[PDB]
Amino acid sequence: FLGPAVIASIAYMDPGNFATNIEGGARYGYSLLWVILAANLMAMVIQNLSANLGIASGRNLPELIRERWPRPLVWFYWIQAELVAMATDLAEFLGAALAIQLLTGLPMFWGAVVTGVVTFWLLRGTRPLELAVGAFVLMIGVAYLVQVVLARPDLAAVGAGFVPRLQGPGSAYLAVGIIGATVMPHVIYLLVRLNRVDVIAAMGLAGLINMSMLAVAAATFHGKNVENAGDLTTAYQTLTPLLGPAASVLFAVALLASGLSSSAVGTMAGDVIMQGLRRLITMLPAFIVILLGMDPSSVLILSQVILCFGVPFALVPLLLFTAHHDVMGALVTRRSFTVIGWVIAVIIIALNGYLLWELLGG
Amino acid sequence: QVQLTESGPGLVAPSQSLSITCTVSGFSLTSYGVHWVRQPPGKGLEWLVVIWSDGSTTYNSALKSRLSISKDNSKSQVFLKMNSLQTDDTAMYYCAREPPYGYWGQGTTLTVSSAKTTPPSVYPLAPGCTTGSSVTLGCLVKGYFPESVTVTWNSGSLSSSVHTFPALLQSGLYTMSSSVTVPSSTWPSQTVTCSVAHPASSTTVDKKLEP
Amino acid sequence: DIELTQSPATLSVTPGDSVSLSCRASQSISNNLHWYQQKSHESPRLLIKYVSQSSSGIPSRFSGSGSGTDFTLSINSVETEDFGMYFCQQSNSWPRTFGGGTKLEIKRADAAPTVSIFPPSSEQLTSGGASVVCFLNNFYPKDINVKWKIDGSERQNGVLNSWTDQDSKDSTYSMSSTLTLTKDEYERHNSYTCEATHKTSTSPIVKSFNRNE
Ligand SMILES: [Os+3]
Ligand SMILES: [Os+3]
Ligand SMILES: [Os+3]
């Protein structure tokens, strides 16, 4: 429909889901559709739990974690959430700088200056711009739906998306990166039945978009052993079979628009979680990381990995408020929803501690 | 200097087992997926299989459920393995992968037949009564195994021209023809003999060619 | 399941005239191709990644030209180090598929075979075998139709042909055609005619021998 499609294109609209989904296509091919599916499946549950808690308690999670918790724990949780928003803005700025160097060839620091003046221009109105960004992201989604029809190994795609298996540090690392990019703390911190159905259908169609992106990054070059896998400059140059000369600039414009939109979205979310200036303190790490002399191709995925590092500090407080009687009243969430959410909370920490043990080994 | 090397050639009976080592150097094997290519001598070639690093084996429909590909990142080796060999699987194997498939191995030869080591049987080919001023004589080596053999012509003639045609497979063994040409004035005046050295059986037959 | 048919099968040319190989496809392959050169008993180095992006360390002689379902690799000013095998491979969809292959050979003026038919060997006669070998040496071009006639009746089976590589001396192909027989197949009949139909002669070059002599 017109509602859910635009809602999905706006709600995902980030360079993290773009970068982490192309890495998985050229490192483990179709064997990461399981990661994508599990990610969206738990993201919808987290969205529903967050909405239920926010409505039945009358406050967002930043306002709640200030009610009943020790002050040092509040400081530690603010450290965690501010590092989360910081990494989100870092990923935004990195994706935008890469898109700018792909479009006009400007170096990533001049691209950061351009993104700063675009943030200045965010404040010839908001009505005309909201259609353009959503239209660009919807067009790139249709472009990848154009390609998902050509993947010859249908049953191989199904079998690789069906059987979950991880092998070594790279597989678990990229899986954690993707599952932390999809399930975002923005989602965790986000006619009621209409809103619920719209969000569910939107996230479902956007999960289809992500599966299409991963399957295309797998079928375009998996065994071709092309020069680079996750270099979004090399990705953009070979991303697409169809409508070639315009496809490269289309991909670059889509990346730039998604980055500039996620900029405002995540920055306003950080302002919400912070007041209950802001743009510069969350921007400085982006500049110091892209100036340190390292290519952003791997840091754009490490940022999603760190967002997954930050997901449990936003997941543990949710269910404790969810399961309560003197607050939820007669509208307490079921015990089975609780059990499913807690199995998910155990699984995420299992994967993250797996990666951490593998890093401790060396 | 990046370089791939392979295992030594192999001669195995049918229904046996075999493995081939493709070792790499100069690049990071754990970061590139290796492809195999089978080429019989002159009989063309078709893409075989790909082992993406970390054990990801994908086989083609042509050669499936018979081949296997092991990997050993400790020594950065790719093992090809075959069971229950047949007659017409003899060929040279290649392993090749760096970024756009640039670097290939020198190739490993693999022959499968039940023939035991048998020294040859040289048959002289006398014209039996002579167009022009030059006459052609022949040697016919037949029924030997393995493949390698060298034919040298000893002739005191003031002129000659030797040819040696490639050995083909007849009924499991190998058959080969060899030519020589001499002036009619020095034949049978000056003897023109044909020696056939089969090193794998230590036998060399110095056959004299007479009418 | 997508295949690749390569044309021509074999190609003859002198140093100086540009050559062009075509690698026709089965369906649309979006500029996914690979050109390899090969020598006798060697490893094929990569020449052309996807199309006409001349690979690492490749001379500027070779150039690709690419479009959907039909790609062409052309060599301008063919130097002596360009002869041998050429192979074409697609890389879009499992399984990868190599083309029909080509063997670029050296070209020169025509020639005529010096046909010589031999009787079975004396030491081979008492061994049971009766091989009537018929040497066809120094002919051009390569394609010949050698034929055996046993008492007029043709012999399409039981024959065995072999061909040498392009001769190192003067680029002229020579071949051999043996006609193995048993005892009855050699004694029931009377004659053995070795004919060779060839381009350079409307009349096939013929040689023959007979048993009683
Ligand atoms: Os207060
Ligand atoms: Os409590
Ligand atoms: Os076959």
Residue numbers in the entry:
A (entry chain A): 43 to 165, 170 to 236, 256 to 341, 351 to 436
B (entry chain H): 1 to 129, 132 to 213
C (entry chain L): 1 to 213
The authors write:
Natural resistance-associated macrophage proteins (Nramps) are APC-superfamily transition metal transporters that enable uptake of rare micronutrients such as Mn2+ in plants and bacteria and Fe2+ in animals. Nramps bind and/or transport biologically-essential divalent metals such as Mn2+, Fe2+, Co2+, Ni2+, Cu2+, Zn2+—and toxic metals like Cd2+, Pb2+, and Hg2+—but not the abundant alkaline earth metals Mg2+ and Ca2+. Metal uptake by Nramps is typically stimulated by acidic pH and accompanied by proton influx. Nramps have 11 or 12 TMs, the first ten forming a LeuT fold, as seen in structures of three bacterial Nramp homologs, including our model system Deinococcus radiodurans (Dra)Nramp.
A previously determined structure of a Fab-bound DraNramp in an inward-open conformation revealed the intracellular metal permeation pathway, or vestibule, between TMs 1a, 2, 5, 6b, 7, and 8. This structure was stabilized in an inward-open state by patches of mutations to intracellular loops 4–5, 6–7, and 10–11, and we thus refer to it as the Patch mutant. Using lipidic cubic phase (LCP) to mimic the hydrophobic membrane environment, we crystallized and determined the structures of G45R and G223W to resolutions of 3.0 and 2.4 Å, respectively, both significantly improved from our earlier DraNramp structure (3.94 Å). The new high-resolution structures also allowed us to re-refine our original structure, including correction of a sequence registry error in TM11. From this transient occluded conformation similar to our G45R structure, additional movement of TM4-TM5 allows TM1a to bend upward to fully open the inner gate, enabling solvent access to and release of the metal, as the protein achieves a state similar to the Patch mutant DraNramp structure.
